[PDB]
Symmetry: D2
Subunit: 392 residues, 4 copies
Amino acid sequence: VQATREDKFSFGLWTVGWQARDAFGDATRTALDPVEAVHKLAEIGAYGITFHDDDLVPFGSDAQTRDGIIAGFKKALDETGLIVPMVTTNLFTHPVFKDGGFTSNDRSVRRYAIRKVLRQMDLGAELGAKTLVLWGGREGAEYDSAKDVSAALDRYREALNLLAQYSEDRGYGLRFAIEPKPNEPRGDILLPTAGHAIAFVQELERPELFGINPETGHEQMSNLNFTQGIAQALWHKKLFHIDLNGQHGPKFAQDLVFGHGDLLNAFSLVDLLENGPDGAPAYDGPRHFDYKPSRTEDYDGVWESAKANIRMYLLLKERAKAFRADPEVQEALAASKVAELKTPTLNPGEGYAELLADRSAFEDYDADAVGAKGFGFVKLNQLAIEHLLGAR
Amino acid sequence: VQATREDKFSFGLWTVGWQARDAFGDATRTALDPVEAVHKLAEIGAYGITFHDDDLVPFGSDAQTRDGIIAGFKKALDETGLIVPMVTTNLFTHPVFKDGGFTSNDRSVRRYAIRKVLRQMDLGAELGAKTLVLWGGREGAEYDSAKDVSAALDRYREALNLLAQYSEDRGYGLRFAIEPKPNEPRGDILLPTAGHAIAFVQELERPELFGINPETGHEQMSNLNFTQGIAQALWHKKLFHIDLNGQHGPKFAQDLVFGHGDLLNAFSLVDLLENGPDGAPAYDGPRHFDYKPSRTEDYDGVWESAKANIRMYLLLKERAKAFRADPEVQEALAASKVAELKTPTLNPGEGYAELLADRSAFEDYDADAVGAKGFGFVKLNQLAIEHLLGAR
Amino acid sequence: VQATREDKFSFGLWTVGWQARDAFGDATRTALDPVEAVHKLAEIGAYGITFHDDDLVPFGSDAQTRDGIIAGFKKALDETGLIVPMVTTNLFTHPVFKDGGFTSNDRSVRRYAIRKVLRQMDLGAELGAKTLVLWGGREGAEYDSAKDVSAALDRYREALNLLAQYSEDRGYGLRFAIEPKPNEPRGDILLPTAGHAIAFVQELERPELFGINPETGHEQMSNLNFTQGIAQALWHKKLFHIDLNGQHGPKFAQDLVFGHGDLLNAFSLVDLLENGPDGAPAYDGPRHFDYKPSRTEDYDGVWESAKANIRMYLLLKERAKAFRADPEVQEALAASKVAELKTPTLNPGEGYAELLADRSAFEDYDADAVGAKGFGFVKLNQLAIEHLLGAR
Amino acid sequence: VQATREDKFSFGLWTVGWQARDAFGDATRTALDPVEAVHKLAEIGAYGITFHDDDLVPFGSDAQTRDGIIAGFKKALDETGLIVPMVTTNLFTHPVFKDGGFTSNDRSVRRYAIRKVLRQMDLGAELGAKTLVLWGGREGAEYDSAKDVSAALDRYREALNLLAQYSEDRGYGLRFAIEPKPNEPRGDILLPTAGHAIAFVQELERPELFGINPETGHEQMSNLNFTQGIAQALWHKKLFHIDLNGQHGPKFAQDLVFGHGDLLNAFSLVDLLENGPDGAPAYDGPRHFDYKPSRTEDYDGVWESAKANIRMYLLLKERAKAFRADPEVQEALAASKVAELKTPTLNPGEGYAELLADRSAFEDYDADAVGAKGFGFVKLNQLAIEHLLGAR
Ligand SMILES: O=C[C@H](O)[C@@H](O)[C@H](O)CO
Ligand SMILES: O=C[C@H](O)[C@@H](O)[C@H](O)CO
Ligand SMILES: O=C[C@H](O)[C@@H](O)[C@H](O)CO
Ligand SMILES: O=C[C@H](O)[C@@H](O)[C@H](O)CO
Ligand SMILES: [Mg+2]
Ligand SMILES: [Mg+2]
Ligand SMILES: [Mg+2]
Ligand SMILES: [Mg+2]
């Protein structure tokens, strides 16, 4: 298969542009020119590109320099037809952000963090971005007594309400997506899982403008089921964006190509997103790859890895489709009663009074006979994997 | 120290009553008589006792027997002065619940599960319990294609809405506390963390009636920071109850005595609950121990372990207070700017307009000079620990 | 695909016979008759069966009963053509073993544990078993001060040395396989990984009679790479047996069907065992499945799951074979220099002096130029997954 | 309590000198001068300093320069009375080492890797170092098909055999300590745990010359019991060196001050190393701190964190001593039968024939009765924790 613009595959400038300087060594690749990155991505089938302010315009560029970069950038976008669906701000690299951006203990840092973001929202709005992703990588602590969490949540909320206000007043029409991460670079990061971020979002002044940007490896860093948390984000209707990559359980963030980590969870994730209710996908935003080409590769490996993300997604999609169109799979689904969960537990108009009145729900319930019937889950799982394996 | 009824130490009947049949071996202790449990707990300092329907009255007891057990149980409470602060229902042991109670694929099981809880609500209301704890230990899956998470959340919501309705109509005045757990016994449990559980509760019909009951070991099974999650729960005002125990990271649930797992986090937790604002505790509910006396122990080890839970809490309490009262700590807190996080980022009346006008927050901000100053967090952490070791 | 006796698939009687009594609930299935298990396994394609003494003869059976049971079992093997490649002893279920068998702090328990094993060695030898597997599930601790590890290792050794003495003297010709596990049921188990078990065995009296029996899920419980661990065991020539199953990282032991956990690792594993040096497998023993049919299944689900194991292994083999046979893979392997690791670093007869005199190895070496060439690893990896997916 | 040269506290140049440039941000501290480091460490009580070649002499310094630095360094040593107990080689930072040093797929890098170490050996020899630590941080892989584990071990062995040859011919008297780590920077590193490294070492040409250098945090990254692995290392007599620091379970390596991660395990570890065999320490080498001052700290924080390491050790030592001297602890130890484990299971001159003849070890053994007695382990654990908290 081949990717179409309708597939909505996007990449961060910082993914294919990662120079591969890790915590233990020097960069192994030279820097990637943004215009060149735009052209190469267009060529492999991406529909959009995203970036942190500091990825495009070097921190501290004078206004003439910044303007020049932006103009050349826009020309590339123009010529290739690529769009900018989301933009983000780097609030983690500069030493000033060592204790966080919006939640640094230092008040002045909190004021500067908000200004850095407002400036990025202007540029995002001018490039046509619809989503602002917020990754508080430095909001957290290494020691419990160093950070008042409650105060931190108050400050977090205080910054986000201002941003929504500015956006709404300027008519930018942006949606905000908080991206959870459990740890790294802080010992413990605030809003550690998709769940924590969703619960926080619900407390903002204008919750409807806020959702989450969950990343495959981030949830896997806590050994949580990514597809299942995505299912819950979809139930809340807070899946505003998604970051796809690979990870091997709890360890530093690996940022492997999507599907190269937990293959079976990648498979069930693609099934969830594309085989939504009513034939159609359950999610329609970008399919964004927030990964890193391995430190062992050169620029050839970089493009190979960019293309592997898309191939992985399309192969899994193909297998998820065949899975569902298989009359044997359908028969197994029926035997396992998956769909029966979709039927209300109470009858139409039944309340507690009528339930209490139904002796078949208790008094005459044969728990023991029901308890002995098998659900056929293993067999269902086996057919799923045989589809993934191309054995069916 | 010594426990008083104002400490509000409570224990589940299933804790000290655990016979020690694990996944790999037979019970090493005989059954504990509930009346005796009441007496023994009263003696060590507990102010209350809790239980699952099935802990007190054997599954499938005739009306006569059930009635008989309750009446003796009420007498023991009477005689001893212990209260029943919370009650819970067993929706995990019987084979009928193998796929869950409220979210079983099987509709007849969901109906039966609701019935079983209504009944315990009645008994709870009758014994004076204020909280209904809901632990969905069988809600989840081993295989992704076997459970429609969205439909399961619908069914979970549907069942809770009804319980609230009933309680309000009967005038029981119960609060409901959902208890999250990431896995075990299901491969993946629905509402895996305190975060996911708060997000969910917010979607119910009468959200003001629902909160969570987080357990130390559950969050640690995912390697999350328990104290930090409780601080978030308190920020949301959803800390309806708490289960205290010990765990050594991502592994099977150990249920050790509180403070026998992650000692540093047990210290910071006690500090957060007790050294609340306005001198007073940030949390006023029961300090409930949901732990298990090790399988290597006899009834003496059982009472020894019960007392250890109390002693650990009180020794930590004593050190958390000394910590906060130390002038050197006060000096370290100041240098760390812990309290500066409580001052709003914006001056009263400032909005984005005024922030944008402040050159000092961006254009004239010296990020480099600010980034060079240390926060003194290591020194502050070292002082906390020396207080914990009784070295200061 | 179809299983042959040459595939050497074996199953423990305790696998398909698991009644599904976990730590949180009662059994969901009835007991399986050993004779019936023998007929069913023979039928699905297994070549052998294994058992714990207590799986076949109920703990405490008189010799009359014991003898009768062995006779019937023996007939079933007879009629079916199944062999007993390995036997093991249950040193974890009975309460007496709450602190271990061989390493219990109680001296009498230690004497008893040895006797229990000698007896099982006798039955093993009578049935033609070649391997005695030792899983020290209760050897370890929940608390650091409770167990002197050094003393424990001395006692583990003392017991094993006696066992080898006896087998050698009785001429049984058995091989001993130590099975490592990090935790569960003890907080921490002695000899937690394949590495620790191999190091320990090297200290026995007759080390050549000892090896390890690593289990997929056991290594994965610590988030280790099972394939890489097996590779090391093979390098040492200590892979005496292997237990195959599935797990999803650090959590309770799941015992899923082989390949239903880390699917990518399941693939590299079959490749390692099967595409050994010169076409031939790198491993020759039994391909033993030590898994459990999920608690949600009935006997139908049980047989299904038994066959899924065989199915998974044969589908994987088939793709591992195709992977290696692919000229494009062959080309990618060359570009990544995988085979160049086989060439000695040193020239023939070259020592320190010749190497120190070689200017090209240091003084005149261009590290920067070599540091920039890519290894093409992502591309090789993508080729492997495409073969797994049946897309190549 | 104050540090003495007898305490043998040592620090790597790279610990206090870490500029806090992490995987997500720029350096927050300026470079530390080596002469300065020697002077500051001498002042806080360190008896020795260690370094990688590249920490002292910048990669690629001409001889004049290198020679100059060493002379200055030696002078500082001289003046302060500090020794160099161990030296190591940086085989991980430079891009040439991206796939490993000794086990890189590239033959030329392997050759260069050996030359770089020989050179460091000469310098170590020159400064009087006794141990060569080898941390194979880049040895491993991100993908299973990229690395032939078997060939890698052959090449790891080939290189070490040569180093020992050279040391021995030259009369250097060095001991070699392999340092295990499960992951980071590589997806999976070869020789991941203490166990894997000990097993490997037993296979070299002069094994007596090889041991391990386990690091607290590295074992904890896999959720292993650090104290328990050290106990096994001591049993094998392979604990040649130790790296002390703190970690919070499986996540990126935190490098916290010793005792700031798992405090209970830090306590059991000091007890193990100090309350050795006679009354004397069980370990006689350097107590080396391989940690990193948190990125949030300035140079005042750096010196505070250095001192914290020594203070945690001395405070734990003091409580470990008190624990063992307590009569109540003695009594708990007696009730738990800790010392009974040190008595041979067999009576002197007893073999399998005598054991088989002992009816009391089996035929007349009352397992039910023994299984009912408790070990009193919780109580023993409780007294240990109370000693730790200075509560007794
Ligand atoms: O772990 C890195 C984060 O995922 C980052 O890439 C965000 O997505 C955007 O700042
Ligand atoms: O992990 C077991 C659960 O904690 C259980 O004890 C509940 O709190 C009550 O159903
Ligand atoms: O985790 C359980 C063990 O794997 C066990 O089944 C052994 O292999 C045999 O005692
Ligand atoms: O994880 C960092 C390593 O521990 C390293 O510092 C070694 O000990 C020396 O190379
Ligand atoms: Mg991301
Ligand atoms: Mg609980
Ligand atoms: Mg096994
Ligand atoms: Mg180290």
